[PDB]
Amino acid sequence: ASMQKLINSVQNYAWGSKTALTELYGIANPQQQPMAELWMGAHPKSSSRITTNGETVSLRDAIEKNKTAMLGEAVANRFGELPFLFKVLCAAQPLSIQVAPNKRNSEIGFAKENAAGPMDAAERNYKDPNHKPELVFALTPFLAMNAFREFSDIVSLLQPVAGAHSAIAHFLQVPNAERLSQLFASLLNMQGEEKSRALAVLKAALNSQQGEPWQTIRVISEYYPDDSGLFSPLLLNVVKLNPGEAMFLFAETPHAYLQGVALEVMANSDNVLRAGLTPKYIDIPELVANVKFEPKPAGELLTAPVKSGAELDFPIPVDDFAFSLHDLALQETSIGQHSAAILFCVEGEAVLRKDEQRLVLKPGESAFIGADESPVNASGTGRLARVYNKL
Secondary structure, three states, rough: EEEEOOOOOEOOOOOOOOOHHHHOOOOOOOOOOEOOOEEEEOOOOOOOEEEEEOOOEEEHHHHHOOHHHHOHHHHHHHOOOEEEEEEEEOOOOOOEEEHHHHHHHHHHHHHHHHHOOOOOOOOOOOOOOOOOOEEEEEEEOOEEEEEEHHHHHHHHHHHHHHHHHHHHHHHHOOOOOHHHHHHHHHHHHHHHHHHHHHHHHHHHHOOOOOOOOOOHHHHHHHOOOHHHHHHHHHHHHEEEEEEOOEEEEEOOEEEEEEEEEEEEEEOOOOOOOOOOOOOOOHHHHHHHHHHOOOOOHHHHHHHOOEEOOOOEEOOOOOOEEEEEEEEEOOOEEEEEOOEEEEEEEEEEEEEEEEEEEEEEEEEOOEEEEOOHHOEEEEEEEEEEEEEEOOO
């Protein structure tokens, strides 16, 4: 079959929503497990499957058998694999702050660590040498953190808590990238009485400061009462994405997913460098070496999409993946690409057609389109998201 409806995995991580996938898409959950992520792709931990004959097969194994045909020649020769994983993300709670090292440093990190051999230890930062560019696209109102605030913004937010830590006072005295780096490291390295002091001052400020990002700190404190990451909304932009809005997560930049439901598209890497809101050991020197202490103005945080006909493209500044939304109507529109694609029904109902084959997707369902099977015609109502490669 030219178009392959996907059988996808749902990760039941303890942080996931017990209800979000059910309420959005009607996915069953009779025993009320946490449903954290719905995976669309060919990840070796849990590949999506396709149906042949009647038998199911791993999408990963199927691509493996047939790389050029499935991925296209460009993707096949550049990456050697499907170069992205596409998820629906549905936490019940705020998640860890993370930084993605760039490609060069991920390579260096992966090698530095092997030469001292241990994969599943807590000292380990680099599971592979890939970078991890990512886009998030809000499905429901989505609260996140991304990038450092303008320095003057940080100064204003830190004034009320100047007494929490001497690193704050030091930054306030000269608010520059050097002292921002020292502050960031100082905060994450707070211990014992130094840490209880700082957290006591912060929690007292919440009673006298109103609005954001103070409210965001309250939200986080429900789950991370004893985490130096509670100060992060004062350093990092807090963003409330409306459904349909997106943000690209650049390298070397702290970010976090705090509340809501989104699509996530990422390059393939299992590397996770944390920067707070975690009980795990953090290697602060390694983290600091992979952070660019440059402000990002709020006006620059969301990706500006571009509409052409029925297609809304979200320009991504890397080659690893591309992302577009497609309006559906009665009159078919042709959706084609030089690569493999995954198509996901965001809302309404999608009827895909390739020659004689018809495939209906309801919201939350997806299909894989191999490169050799492009283009397909789409009709119906609502919108289809597509992950692909523009190479």
